[PDB]
Structure 1
């Protein structure tokens, strides 16, 4: 009977000593097992494996609590989905484009590229230690762990078309936005005025207009009485705002926004590109970079810097 001593983990922080029989697969001993992002479930232990660290699924209460503390998820499938994705994202390339970490196109990953580029231009902290640690490495240019985590957190597999707005919405749940506040007014010349306060994620995301300025001036929306009402921003407290709308032709003006997402295509097949406002407008398309003084195209999300805004509408 031939054995080696190894370490298992769910987080690569807390290691647990184990002895494995070299005649049985890791599968038969630990369940699904991963070594440096590779599935070794069906592999037998090799001499060169001795002393190494393997990821396993949280199959007991110690591993479940360690996974909950590192990833801030209780979902039992999470670590499986993360390791599956990491096998592919380890093989992506992460070039520096215009001073930001991007992703070279692969596996329909344009939505992840524009999300990563966006996160580098807005003030945001992730609460799960896994996610903040991976985020800092991604900013430095080693984004494989961070992209695999985004996929695992969003219940998306490598190769599946994604939606930037949906992705941001899931990541923002894991971010420190609790103190973000939005107050808005809806005014009907008949029904009167109705105020609404939002907190957290709901305070920094809007679906229906790309224009922050328009939101501040008032946008027309229907009233239940048949009149058109005006909805406007009363007060905003957040480090940014994300304004989203179904894709349509839209002009982006240098110096009026931080960055934006463009989407070409449909629900079967499509492509995101990132537009950022620096000294001029840059289009970051995975590894590709183009500049222009103007830009017009099918924008679906725009991001704006903020701290504290109050209306002067009486």
Structure 2
């Protein structure tokens, strides 16, 4: 008087939980919201082909809420749905190899994700949420759909929003292991004197104000609360890279003095991005398009550099 089939539910595709489903009911009445391979199967009953398949569900109990925090570092119950929604788009994007890197063919306002994807393939980063690191790896190999969909979900951005590459990175670094990154800087006032300031994690590897990492060790002008103009410089830096950002402006990029950079053209919040990377020569990745040049002069807003351990000589 009731027929049933075996299926496995999961919130991380890693702890599979055996269930038996009633072929006269929908996955919705039995499980709550259900996805099979991204497809919202909530309003559908079990077709017989489903035996043995794995389905994604929302974390209804407290075990799953833990199983899900461990995989994604989220408690937000909308996460699964926002992600599954982005994945419906990103599974259709193309992800070519350009210049030995995984890019994204232009689609639905995704210039800023491609510049972000390209940059992540060129700096040293371990992400803490296993969902991020698995998609990171798989994106290195060309299967970037899940990686991009997770970025959209972590950013509470959605396909078709135009993004900001610096902020996209800052959303992601919060779940990266930068716990041994250290930045010590010294700010010096003609009046007040000198104050050392020592910051760490995400704050140790990100700066907004100047693009030149060289300028940053020499000294950069910052206003002082006490009123005069002060000078801030870098005295120590342990971290494998550094992000230097500043609002778009014409800037020259010299082969071999940097890792890669975000070129942004247009106005606040409606411009386009392209990716500049320093290899044997300068390369410009625009989604599926690439160009080469000896030198580059143009509108740059982030420049990434390599570091291991720096110490100023300024006494």
TM-score range, shorter chain: over 0.9
Q: Which runs of 5+ in 2 are unaligned?
A: none
1:265 is displaced (CA, Å) by 2.3
1:107 is displaced (CA, Å) by 1.2
Alpha-carbon distance between aligned partners in 2 of 1:43 and 1:294, rounded to the nearest angstrom: 58
Q: How many residues align?
A: 314
Alpha-carbon distance between aligned partners in 2 of 1:9 and 1:237, rounded to the nearest angstrom: 39
SS at match of 2:60: coil
Q: 1:23 to 1:265 in 2, by over 3 A?
A: farther
1:3 is displaced (CA, Å) by 2.9
Alpha-carbon distance between aligned partners in 2 of 1:43 and 1:95, rounded to the nearest angstrom: 35
1:267 is displaced (CA, Å) by 4.2
| TM score, norm. by length of structure 2 | 0.96
After superposition, the C-alpha distances for 1:83-128 in whole angstroms (9 at most, x for unaligned) are: 1111111111111111011111111111111111101111111111
1:4 is displaced (CA, Å) by 2.3
Alpha-carbon distance between aligned partners in 1 of 2:226 and 2:133, rounded to the nearest angstrom: 48
1:266 is displaced (CA, Å) by 2.8
4+ runs deviating over 6 angstroms: none
SS at match of 2:124: coil
| TM score, norm. by length of structure 1 | 0.97
Alpha-carbon distance between aligned partners in 2 of 1:122 and 1:153, rounded to the nearest angstrom: 20
1:264 is displaced (CA, Å) by 1.7
Alpha-carbon distance between aligned partners in 2 of 1:119 and 1:277, rounded to the nearest angstrom: 15
SS at match of 1:162: coil
SS at match of 2:134: helix
1:46 is displaced (CA, Å) by 0.9
SS at match of 1:116: helix
Alpha-carbon distance between aligned partners in 1 of 2:39 and 2:120, rounded to the nearest angstrom: 28
1:268 is displaced (CA, Å) by 4.8
Alpha-carbon distance between aligned partners in 2 of 1:224 and 1:130, rounded to the nearest angstrom: 43
Q: Which moved more, 1:163-172 or 1:1-10?
A: 1-10
Q: CA-atom RMSD, angstroms?
A: 1.2
After superposition, the C-alpha distances for 1:164-213 in whole angstroms (9 at most, x for unaligned) are: 11111111111110110001111111111111001100000001111100
Alpha-carbon distance between aligned partners in 2 of 1:26 and 1:111, rounded to the nearest angstrom: 37
Q: 1:24 to 1:266 in 2, by over 3 A?
A: farther
After superposition, the C-alpha distances for 1:212-242 in whole angstroms (9 at most, x for unaligned) are: 0001111111223432211111111000000
Q: Which runs of 5+ in 1 are unaligned?
A: none
